[PDB]
Structures are given as C-alpha cells and as structure tokens.
Ligand binder design. Structure first.
Ligand SMILES: Cc1cc2nc3c(=O)[nH]c(=O)nc-3n(C[C@H](O)[C@H](O)[C@H](O)COP(=O)(O)O)c2cc1C
Ligand SMILES: Cc1cc2nc3c(=O)[nH]c(=O)nc-3n(C[C@H](O)[C@H](O)[C@H](O)COP(=O)(O)O)c2cc1C
Ligand code: NA
Ligand code: NA
Lengths: 311, 311
C-alpha cells in the first residue's frame, strides 16, 4: 500500500529497513524481512570476506527480493568487504558509524545503492554530496553504537538539510513510530530491536526475552569515555564496564572484545553486551517477521486517520 | 481549529503549553502565550510566595485567558507555593521532576488542574491514580532537568499506559513535532526553548541568540553524577562543570548555585547555565509568540495532509 521515494529507490514493497546488526543480522532473518516486502540487511560486523560471500549467496537461496549488506568502517576488512559487495552485485550497501566517503564512488559505479548511517545534519549533507542515495538518521535511543541527537530532533533537522530520502532509525517499533517518523520528514524506517524479537531470529532465546521484559528504562550506554558509546541492556556486567571505563580503560576495552557474541549466540548475561534500543520497552511479544510488518503498516494507517480526525 | 481532550480540559484554544521555566517563565511571556490561545505558565523556580503572588496578579493584568504555574518539588517553599496557587485559584498547576502526589488532592479540592511532569510510564501511572488530570511526558532531549528516555519512545509508551491525556515535551519546535507527537499518542505539546526564542521574552538577548546559532549538537548534560542531570548549551563553563562533578563534586554543586540567573538575566557565558533542549538547532529566528503558534498550527496541518498522501 504505502509507497515513498525509498520504495522506488530500492524496488521495495514497504518502507521498512532491517538495521544491519553484527552477529544478529543473519541471512535467515534478513531473508524473512525481504520476503515480507521490507529490506533485510546482512550484518557483516565480525565477518571476513569469505563469511560475507557465503552469507550473501545463502541469502539468495532464500529470496530473490532486494537486500542489503552492512559494513563497519572500523572493521579490519572494510575494504575487502566492500569489494565482496561489488563482485556479488549487492543491491544496497549500508555503512555503520563514521564517514564512508572513500567507498561511495566505486559502489555507485557498480549499481549498488549506498545508504550511510549518520547522526548529524553536517555528516548527512557531507555524504549526500559524496554521492549517497539515501541516509539513515539514527537517534541515540537506538541499540548498538549511538550518537548525541535523539530521533525526534535528528530526523526533523536532517530531512530539511538534504534532498535525498531520509530513513529514520532508533526507537521505531510499531505503526505509531512510522507515522511520527514520516511526520518528522522521513520516507522510511529502519528497525533493529523489533526484528531481533521475531521468531525467524536465531539469537539465544534469552536475548529475545530480555527484550520482551525490558522496559524503556532498562538500557544504559557503555563505552562513552572510550569514544565508542553503545546502548546495551541494563545489566550488572554493563555497569561493571561503565565503572571500568574510568578506572582501567584498557582493561575495559578487552572486557568488551567478543562481548556481543556471548550475548547473541550463548545468551551469557554475565559477559554479554545485549545491544538494544529503548524501543525494547515497546516490545511485548515475539512475532513472525511478516506479522510485524503488516501490524506496523495497518497501525501506521490507523494513526494517519486519527491525525486526520483533528481537521 | 485543532481541538483535543487537552483543549477541553484547560478551556484552551490550541494544544500548546509553555513549559514552566525558572527565571525565564515570566508573567509577560506567559501572558503572550495565553493571549495567543496557548497556555502560558509562570515558572516559580526561584520565587518566594510573595514573588509568586505578585507574578500571578501581574499576569491577570495582561490576560483573562487560562494560565498555569510551575512548582519545583525540591524548592524550599514548595508547600507555601502550592498554597499560594490555591488561594489565588490558579487554573492549572505544573510540577517539575519528582513525585507530586502529596499536593494532588488539595489542589484538586480547589478546582485546580494538576499536570505533573514525568519521565517514565510507572510514574505517569502512579500520578494518574494520585488524581492527576493530565501528564507531561518529557524526553531527555529537553532543556533543563532531564530523564533517561527520549521523546520518541517516552510519549509512545506513556500514552498506552495511562488513560488521562498525555502532553509531549522535549524536542518540539514546529508543526512537524506536533504532528509526530500526536502520532506517538499525545494530545498536546509543551515547548520551552522555542518560547525563549520569542520577542516577548525578556531573557538577555545573548541567550535568545545562542539559541538561534546553536545546532542540534550544541548541548551537553551537566549534573549527571550529582544526581540532577540538566541539559545546557555546550559551553566551556559547562565542560568545566562536567569535569568538576568527578574531581570536586561539592565545589561543583556550588558552581551551579545561581548559574541559571547569570545566563538568563545577564547573559554571562563564563558563569551561566544556558538550559536549552536539542530543539535549539531547529530554531533559526526570533518570532513573536502568536506567530510561533500560528506557524506551528499551519505546518501541523500541512504535515497531516502529507501523511494522508500515503493512502
Ligand atoms: C544487537 C545490535 C547490533 C547492531 N549492530 C550494528 C552494526 O553492526 N552496524 C550498524 O551500523 N548498526 C548496528 N545496530 C543498529 C541497528 O542497525 C539499528 O540502526 C538500530 O537498532 C535502530 O534502533 P532500534 O533498536 O530502536 O530499532 C545494531 C543494533 C543492535 C540491537
Ligand atoms: C531555561 C529553562 C528552564 C527550565 N526550567 C524548568 C523548571 O523550572 N521546571 C520544570 O519543570 N521544567 C523546566 N524547564 C523544562 C521546560 O518546562 C520544558 O519541559 C522543556 O523546555 C521542553 O524541552 P524543549 O526545550 O526542547 O522545548 C526549563 C527549560 C528551560 C530551557
Ligand atoms: Na520489553
Ligand atoms: Na539554532
């Protein structure tokens, strides 16, 4: 039903992206998102080029619909992962935090849509010129690495500053979020925590369920003094890291090495980084990916009719 | 034009509140907001009971429309300020951060509408029972004291948790904000920084203009380790306070004593706390209060028509 500049740009059915997620954005879960009319995205967080090549191929076994790949600029294999996306003709590439200008042009030579994740208007506009096709404006309530501006303000300001489509991310978990994000100027939404809490997800069921029971207050920011702030589930281990950032900052940096995997794969609460957004307190049950998208789209429609009721 | 449960509850024309502000919410500026169809609110931040009584009276010299008074629960004269509001029959009382349950019942005996400011659903619901008539859900992007949840998430979650009207605050500066806040479940909006940047305001013109030139990144949070976190303009003096919170926390607490006034009244950047929300980067000019309200209402309407275009 709903169609935007983002639906045209990606030949997509719904304006819903799956956030690139390291260790959580598997080919299985991204395929279900693409089959349901959204845009799944493989999270190449801790992947070597062979891992990504195999993941790309095993996603095309599960769907012929468009999909994307997410690359962390800080990754030791960022350059190689970009070339993997090129020679596999990945339709859409997403970039994590940083400035992916050095990769725009060659990805655009190959017909790949480039959508950087930004946390400021000045960087949104900087990549817009660099050639980017769209921009994901991610507020600080999101899970994983965060910026300093909230979704409510960032999406508004970025939309007015660039002419390419803006995709709101951070805190979106239902049809009200999409409506409000669209009201703020976005033309699609990207969700992470809402798509981890799906039956197609293969995260350790502890993870899914810590999301179900988490309130909107049950997150904290770790890594802020080390320069890389990230939002995780409020847990004793996370408070230990907040302390260790001040007292022993290098021992803290090693305490997080591989901490996301012990959360994702093994559901280890004592040594895991359960990256989640504040949206977790908006999530109350595990739903199949297609049901999530259709529920969000109907509620998005009903919210617009209510907003109409005021005129 | 636009009418909600909040417009009925307050016999107000538009669903726009002026945030209670200490040293900035003067009877002059709140009168202009009430005359323009919104709800001005006197900020009794640093007022003794005589100050508030005189301020209330000198507001009724400037308008006969409804208005409110904001009380800080931490104030040495909170109890006396509440009784002043009673014997002057103030129509609406707003409470700052904390739990104002001890004041609900007696204010409700006197025909005064009680609207606490909350930063969680559990406190929103707790005051809803205590008898509150509405609730201001204030996200962490707001100016002044802040909570831990962003507007995009808090307004959504609080609206579903209570049946009394929810008023979105924090990050709202234009008609898109109102539309998105309404989409999130609110039935009115409260603004602070947008109403400081008005010609009717009497803050030192440095203050207004530091708001004009501030981006959405030009704020920081001070007072977080001392327990009372507040969002101020990103300034060297504010960074000095962030440092002094760790090293000499009691010397820091005295560094903030009266720091809001040197900002408001004297525009002292070296010793002032320029409380502002991230919305400051959405504000580009100084406008008269009535123009602000009508611009916001028209843009609110045009945003709803755009949202309609997607069906
Ligand atoms: C477990 C987890 C891992 C994530 N990993 C990445 C990542 O590797 N790269 C990236 O750019 N974003 C990453 N994100 C952020 C998401 O892509 C998305 O932008 C964010 O989840 C949106 O916020 P939400 O959780 O409120 O929906 C991650 C998020 C989560 C929850
Ligand atoms: C200078 C200033 C002073 C404020 N003082 C108070 C106060 O004394 N009590 C209170 O409850 N809120 C206070 N606030 C918060 C406002 O009432 C309002 O909720 C907030 O400004 C909304 O965020 P916004 O600036 O993005 O519009 C203050 C805000 C500012 C900017
Ligand atoms: Na939850
Ligand atoms: Na500004």
């Amino acid at each position: 039903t709903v169609r935007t500049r983002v639906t045209d740009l990606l030949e997509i059915e719904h304006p819903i992206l799956m956030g690139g997620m390291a260790w959580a954005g598997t080919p299985t879960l991204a395929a279900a998102v693409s089959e349901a009319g959204g845009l799944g995205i493989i999270g190449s967080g801790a992947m070597k080029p062979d891992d990504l090549r195999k993941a790309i191929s095993e996603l095309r076994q599960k769907t012929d619909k468009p999909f994307g790949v997410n690359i962390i600029l800080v990754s030791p294999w960022a350059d190689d992962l970009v070339k993997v996306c090129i020679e596999e003709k990945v339709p859409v590439v997403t970039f994590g935090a940083g400035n992916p200008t050095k990769y725009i042009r060659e990805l655009k030579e190959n017909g790949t849509k480039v959508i950087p994740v930004v946390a400021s208007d000045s960087l949104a506009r900087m990549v817009e010129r660099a050639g980017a096709d769209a921009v994901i404006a991610e507020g600080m309530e999101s899970g994983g690495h965060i910026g300093e501006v909230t979704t409510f303000v960032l999406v508004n300001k970025v939309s007015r500053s660039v002419n390419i489509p803006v995709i709101a991310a951070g805190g979106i978990a239902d049809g009200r979020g999409m409506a409000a994000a669209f009201a703020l100027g976005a033309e699609a939404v990207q969700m992470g925590t809402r798509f981890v809490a799906s039956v197609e997800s293969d995260v350790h069921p502890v993870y899914k369920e810590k999301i179900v029971k988490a309130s909107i207050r049950d997150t904290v920011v770790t890594g802020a003094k080390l320069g890389h702030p990230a939002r995780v589930l409020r847990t004793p281990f996370a408070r230990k890291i907040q302390e260790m950032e001040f007292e022993n900052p290098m021992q803290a940096e090693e305490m997080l090495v591989g901490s996301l995997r012990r959360a994702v794969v093994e559901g280890d609460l004592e040594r895991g980084s359960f990256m989640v957004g504040q949206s977790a307190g908006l999530i109350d049950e595990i739903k199949p990916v297609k049901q999530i998208i259709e529920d969000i789209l109907k509620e998005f429609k009903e919210t617009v009719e209510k907003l109409r009721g005021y005129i």
